[PDB]
Structure 1
Amino acid sequence: RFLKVKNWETDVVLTDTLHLKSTLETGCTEHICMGSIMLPTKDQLFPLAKEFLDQYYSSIKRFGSKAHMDRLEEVNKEIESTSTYQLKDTELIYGAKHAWRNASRCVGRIQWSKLQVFDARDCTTAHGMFNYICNHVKYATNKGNLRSAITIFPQRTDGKHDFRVWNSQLIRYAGYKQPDGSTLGDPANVQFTEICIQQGWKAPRGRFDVLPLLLQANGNDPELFQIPPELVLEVPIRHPKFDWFKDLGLKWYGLPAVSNMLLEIGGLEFSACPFSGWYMGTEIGVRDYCDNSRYNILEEVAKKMDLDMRKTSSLWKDQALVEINIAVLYSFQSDKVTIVDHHSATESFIKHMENEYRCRGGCPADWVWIVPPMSGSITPVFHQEMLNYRLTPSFEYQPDPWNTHVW
């Protein structure tokens, strides 16, 4: 019931009680651990509302006050009559910050309380959504000095009037299947790109075409919009020592901005809630560039470095990997676009865990996602035991809309 986590590098032992407040289920049982699996009414709504308002009023040191009781009464009345309820602005901001705070897969949570929340609940159309999104993008980008932001569109009603951003991230590159058999651009985006073409987009058919937004308002058919190119900050990738690196013609975008998740606050569901921060270098240099099923560039780079690609044991992959990641960080730093390296981010996350343990009694964390995809054990998170559990408010996965939407 009281649980210990140990750091094996420093011998620091922390005690977790926060897990006892966990509500949702992990996927694991006493017989089987699913830690490495990627995706493991009026009646229902009032307990959820109560649980949330209780933590909210506790958070502002007003638990059991008349203002607390009054709101609980007000929301109860609203559900009983309308079958749903509306969050106060203060509750919305609190819930959004807390969904990030509770995101057990996020290494960047030291920043959780510094989050700009844009209330787009008054939005009614896809053009409205586009306006809101451009404003988010411009605000967050801030000419390279990135600021965390979330934009919150109207909540689920009867589930037939959902707001959705069809894109997986606000900014991503198109992927195209070639007569050749291979793939031009980002292979992850092939299907979404086809949907864009199918709905009318004119693809420029290049390696790095910023996708258009496909926005769905009020459960209507989604529409296409090109983000003003001048709001999409991109970084050409060069190496501080290798002059040939630029010849690879690599670039990435500055703003990471997840648009396909569902924000759950007090039982209310916000199916369109794009949010953004700033990159950790490895996300681009390790995953986007080096995953076999992504831009998969390790072979080309290794060749340009004239490494012995005969045997895996020359560690040519590992050598090229480091250089690619040096280039990513260098290019972002040189163009003054906020980025964090994996040493710095993991060091911050350990300090954040320690703060959360002393001030909240714990910190849910998914070791499988928190440990960076390169150089695991030379980062402090590798040696840190973590307990993974699901607290609410939360960000959740949801089915891709095209599998669900009726035209």
Structure 2
Amino acid sequence: CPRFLKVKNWETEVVLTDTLHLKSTLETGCTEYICMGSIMHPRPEDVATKDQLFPLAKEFIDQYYSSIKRFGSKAHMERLEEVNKEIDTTSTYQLKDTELIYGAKHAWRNASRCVGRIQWSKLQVFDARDCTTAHGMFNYICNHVKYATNKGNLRSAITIFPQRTDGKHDFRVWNSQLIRYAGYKQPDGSTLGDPANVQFTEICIQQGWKPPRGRFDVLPLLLQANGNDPELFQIPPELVLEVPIRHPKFEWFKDLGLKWYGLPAVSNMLLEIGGLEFSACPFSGWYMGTEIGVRDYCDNSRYNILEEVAKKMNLDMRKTSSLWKDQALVEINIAVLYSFQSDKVTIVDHHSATESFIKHMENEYRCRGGCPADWVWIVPPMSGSITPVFHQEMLNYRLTPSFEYQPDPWNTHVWK
């Protein structure tokens, strides 16, 4: 691989030089002759063997001691020997609290698809590796929600449950996010609630959940501890902060009865540190408005209120070239930002977030020698080119620690 790599910003002419790509540790899916940059994702027995784990742990341990300016030190060599001894006798090892916190912050810092990473070092890390039961998982998750929510002054956070051991004792959160709304397919084919969530809603109902059958029913938590069958828990509703969506000019917008929750909390990904696998690690920050306003509302396989908004706007919906879709999309995203700001719930518009990300990316190139970024995901789903990431070249590559995808647990669980 070539040793220096330049990315150019075509709007400002700034050229940056990436050396950090030489530390990349896993595959992007691309080859010399094909590019998978727009592919979304390019056995329970399988855990890391003694031999695979040694290099992965030393790799991480070295990187940690280099970060605290103690590389090659006595404390570094001793920690190497102690980690190596644990792997030798017990086939795994345990991270220190210092290294767990470092590893979580760096999995976010390394997350190429996240436009929010200017915040990467202000992340509250909750060590939940002492959890043994799904009730205990419920306790840790409630405390996460309340802290992160902070009455609307949101704060970013991750709760890290025990690492994988033999693959038959995993901790998993079956929900894809801690807070989502239920979706119900009707016998007539239509959908009530959130169509993205129909499958998980059906699983919950099989597991015993009594559905209210409404538009905005917060889904229960489905929680698996130590490889056991998962269990249901209702989140205390006073912990679920919500914003009713209204519009600063259209008095009729409130009459649509829309609301959204304040806290985006992803709970189905896997955190990899030093070759250790934390299959339950929910993490939360705060919304970019377009994640609600464009995707959560206007996607056809979502709440698809685009037509309903355009109807109340008196827009010619007979031809696409009227841009009636584009005009409704902007107003909805205007409402979403205005409702969150009015109720003083933290939220960032896509102009401010993309402008922070450029500033962040440059500092990373300066202080770190690079910043992996996934342009396909960094650029917002509306008004792309009137944000500065559009004209920003980016290099994508996977560093560790990292957040990884993992199969949905109902596909893999061995039912007791």
TM-score interval, smaller chain: over 0.9
| 1:54-109 per-position Cα deviation (integer Å, ceiling 9, x unaligned) | 11000000000010000000000000000000000000000000000000000000
Secondary structure of the structure 1 residue equivalent to 2:385: helix
Superposition deviation, residue 370 in structure 1: 0.1
Residue of 289, 300, 312 corresponding to 1:304: 312
Q: Deviations over 1:162-207 (max 9, x none)?
A: 0000000000000000022111111111110010000000000001
How far 1:141 sits from its partner (Å)? 0.1
> d(CA) in 1 for partners of 2:319 and 2:296?
25
Contact 2:8 2:392 in 1 (8 A): yes
For the Cα contact (< 8 Å) 1:48–1:267, is it kept in 2?
yes
Residue 183 (structure 1) aligned with residue 191 (structure 2):
yes
The answer to whether 1:227 aligns with 2:235 is yes
Give the whole-Å Cα distance in 2 for the aligned partners of 1:372 and 1:167: 25
Other-structure match for 1:393: 401
Query: Could you tell me how far 1:310 is from its partner in structure 2?
Result: 1.2
The C-alpha deviation readout for 1:351-384, integer Å capped at 9, x for no partner, is: 0000100000000000000000000000000000
Match of 1:25 in 2: 27
Counterpart CA distance in 2 for 1:296 and 1:3 is 42
Determine the C-alpha separation between the residues in 2 that align with 1:225 and 1:246: 31
- Given that residues 28 and 398 in structure 2 are in contact (C-alpha distance below 8 angstroms), is that contact kept between their aligned partners in structure 1? yes
Q: What does the per-residue CA deviation read over 1:24-54, in whole Å, with 9 as the maximum and x for residues that have no partner?
A: 0000011100000009900000100000011
* SS at 1:320 equivalent: helix
Say if 1:26 and 1:40, in contact at 8 Å, map to a contact too: no
For 2:291 and 2:132, locate their aligned partners in 1 and report how far apart those are by CA, in whole Å: 34
Contact 1:163 / 1:219 at 8 angstroms: preserved in 2? yes
Asked if structure 2 preserves the Cα contact closer than 8 Å seen for 1:161 and 1:217, the reply is: yes
User: 1:209: how far off?
Assistant: 0.4
TM-score by length of 2: 0.97
TM-score computed with the length of structure 1 as normaliser: 0.99
Distance 2:200 2:256 in 1: 26
Hey, what's the Cα distance between the residues in 1 that align with 2:196 and 2:230? 21
Q: For the residues of structure 2 that align with 1:136 and 1:181, how far apart are their CA atoms?
A: 37
Distance across 2 between alignment mates of 1:392 and 1:68: 19
**Segments of 4+ in structure 1 off by > 2 A?**
none
Distance in 1 (alpha carbons) for counterparts of 2:54 and 2:298: 47
2:156 touches 2:284 (CA, 8 Å); kept in 1? yes
Secondary structure in structure 2 of the residue aligned to 1:260: coil
Is the CA contact (8 Å cut-off) linking 1:262 and 1:272 kept in structure 2?
yes
Contact 2:48-2:275 at 8 Å conserved across structures: no
Higher mean Cα deviation, 179-188 or 21-30?
179-188
SS at match of 1:380: coil
SS in 2 for 1:346: helix
Gap regions ≥5 residues in structure 2:
41-46
Is this contact kept in 1: 2:148–2:154, CA < 8 A? Answer: yes
Identity between Structure 1 and Structure 2 (%): 97
Q: Deviation string for 1:380-400 (max 9, x for gaps)? A: 000000000000000000000
Deviation at 1:271, TM superposition (A): 0.2
Among residues 313, 316, 319, which one is paired with 2:321 in the alignment? 313
Kept in 1, the 8 Å contact 2:173–2:267? The answer is: yes
Count of residue pairs the alignment pairs up: 407
Q: Any conservation in 2 of the 1:27–1:40 contact (CA below 8 Å)?
A: no
Whether contact under 8 Å (2:111, 2:402) holds in the other structure is yes
Task: Quote the offset at 1:4 in angstroms.
Answer: 0.2
Q: Residues 249-288 of structure 1 correspond to what in structure 2 (within 5 A)?
A: 249-288=257-296
**Gap regions ≥5 residues in structure 1:** none
Is the partner of 1:85 in helix, strand or coil?
A: coil
What is the aligned partner in structure 2 of residue 206 from structure 1? 214
- Residues 347 and 379 in structure 1, CA contact (< 8 A), matched pair in contact too: yes
| Match in the other structure for 1:61 | 69
Cα deviation for residue 288 of structure 1 reads 0.3
> 2:174, 2:223 within 8 Å by CA — same for their partners in 1?
yes
- CA distance in structure 1 between the partners assigned to 2:29 and 2:194 by the alignment: 31
- C-alpha separation in 1, matches of 2:52 and 2:352: 42
1:34 and 1:40 in contact (8 A); partners too: no
2:297/2:304 contact within 8 Å kept: yes
Q: Does the 8 Å CA contact 1:332/1:339 hold for their aligned counterparts? A: yes
Q: Within 2, Cα distance between the matches of 1:207 and 1:231?
A: 19
